[PDB]
């Protein structure tokens, strides 16, 4: 019913990619206007494909990158189109979907590099962040949404430190502020990666490798662990933060000393034992053992 035009859009989107580039933007815009008058319960299935259309067409404009001189201008217009199409879905009281579509747009603009692409990419990111704050309240949806924002930001290399530092800090706060202590801890440690593998345009393509900041991130993560107040999850959060330390240790992050790994493995030894035989309690041992077997200490 409200989704009976999907198969329909599939063909459309498919065949659209065969028509020539300058032709597509026009056809894509009328397809929008057409589905735009569709309703609000319909644009949910109908407009997204058009959004990916825009993205793919943005790359097509570049792959035609010496035969046209205004290709960079076309890209700016098509990204303005995507921004628009997505805002339509928000008006139709949607959040999850639009947040992910903005992310995709951010990634796209990053990769294409047309002119003003960074400004566009930054707009698409904060727009995604806006949806996260304002429209996403459920705890579960949060961990998933912020984890998606961090994973996306981590792949991007187009931002200048002036832009990278804000998003970078903004993710850390969002993470430390999640509803539950468990999710809070996992997320904050995931942010570690933003300070290690993240790439700004200042180190001329190189990763920041902020061992120092990576440590503080996992540090705050640990603090969150000590409060979880639950035998089973408390430990389980410890084993995870331990593997995470290992992730950076083995990447030769000088800050991650072997002493730190020892202190954490030890605490985990003094706690893993006090658990009721469970389908889970057993897996947390296997997990810890897998981790120790990996370090060769078992």
């Amino acid at each position: 019913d409200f989704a009976d035009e999907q198969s329909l859009v599939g063909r459309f989107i498919h065949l659209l990619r065969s028509e020539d580039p300058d032709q597509q933007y026009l056809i894509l815009n009328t397809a929008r206007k057409h589905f735009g008058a569709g309703g609000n319960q319909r644009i949910r299935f109908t407009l997204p494909p058009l959004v990916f259309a825009a993205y793919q067409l943005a790359f097509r404009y570049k792959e035609n990158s010496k035969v046209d001189d205004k290709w960079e201008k076309k890209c700016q217009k098509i990204f303005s189109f995507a921004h628009q199409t997505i805002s339509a879905l928000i008006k139709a009281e949607l959040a999850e979907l639009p947040l992910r579509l903005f992310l995709q747009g951010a990634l796209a603009a990053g990769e294409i590099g047309f002119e003003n692409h960074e400004t566009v990419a930054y707009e698409f990111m904060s727009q995604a962040f806006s949806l996260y704050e304002d429209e996403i309240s459920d705890s579960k949806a949060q961990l998933a949404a912020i984890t998606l924002i961090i994973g996306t930001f981590e792949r991007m290399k187009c931002f200048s430190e002036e832009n990278h530092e804000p998003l970078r800090t903004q993710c850390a706060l969002a993470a430390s502020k999640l509803l539950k202590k468990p999710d809070q801890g996992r997320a904050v440690s995931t942010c570690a990666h933003l300070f290690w593998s993240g790439r700004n345009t200042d180190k001329n393509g190189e990763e920041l490798h902020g061992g120092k900041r990576v440590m503080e991130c996992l540090k705050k993560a640990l603090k969150i662990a000590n409060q979880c107040m639950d035998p089973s999850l408390q430990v389980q959060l410890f084993i995870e933060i331990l593997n995470r330390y290992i992730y950076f240790y083995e990447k030769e992050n000088d800050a991650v000393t072997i002493q730190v790994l020892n202190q954490l493995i030890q605490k985990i030894r003094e706690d893993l034992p006090n658990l009721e035989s469970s389908e889970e309690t057993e897996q947390i041992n296997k997990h810890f053992h897998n981790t120790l077997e990996h370090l060769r200490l078992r």
Binding site: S7, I13, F52, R100, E111, E154, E240, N243, R244
Partner: protein, 183 residues
Amino acid sequence: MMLVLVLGDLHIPHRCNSLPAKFKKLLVPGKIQHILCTGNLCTKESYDYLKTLAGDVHIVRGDFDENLNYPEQKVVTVGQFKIGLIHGHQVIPWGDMASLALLQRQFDVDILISGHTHKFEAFEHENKFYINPGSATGAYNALETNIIPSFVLMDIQASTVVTYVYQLIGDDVKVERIEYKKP
């Protein structure tokens, strides 16, 4: 001795309308006894088609699937093999081997299937096996401008697996064999 089908990231109808013409001709009922789907096929329409090729289908929730009722990750046992399933977007950095490995420990699986990158990968690491079918529809992906359609069906006799990677290069469908056996 059972064979399983592994595919995902079809992205229908978000970026593709269906699986490549030739691939459809290779996936027919009767042959497959198992199906592990990583990706976001997105539409329930694609779940039904899957339900065709076989009856025991396993799917994990991808970052764009409509139905929120799918598992973030799932562990399914196939004979002597314990196999994990997850889409991949939860693994940061996205296609990082070290991060996948870290995940393998926690799951405690012999083989780990994931997608999200849309790049086929079949390799061994510290006595464990890692498989990424890729995108059965060569679905678009901002990080890689040149995606190659593909799926992968593995054949398990017993504590020995042979994974067949199906790529769609040019017109013809090239293939590649890779074997793995429990440590």
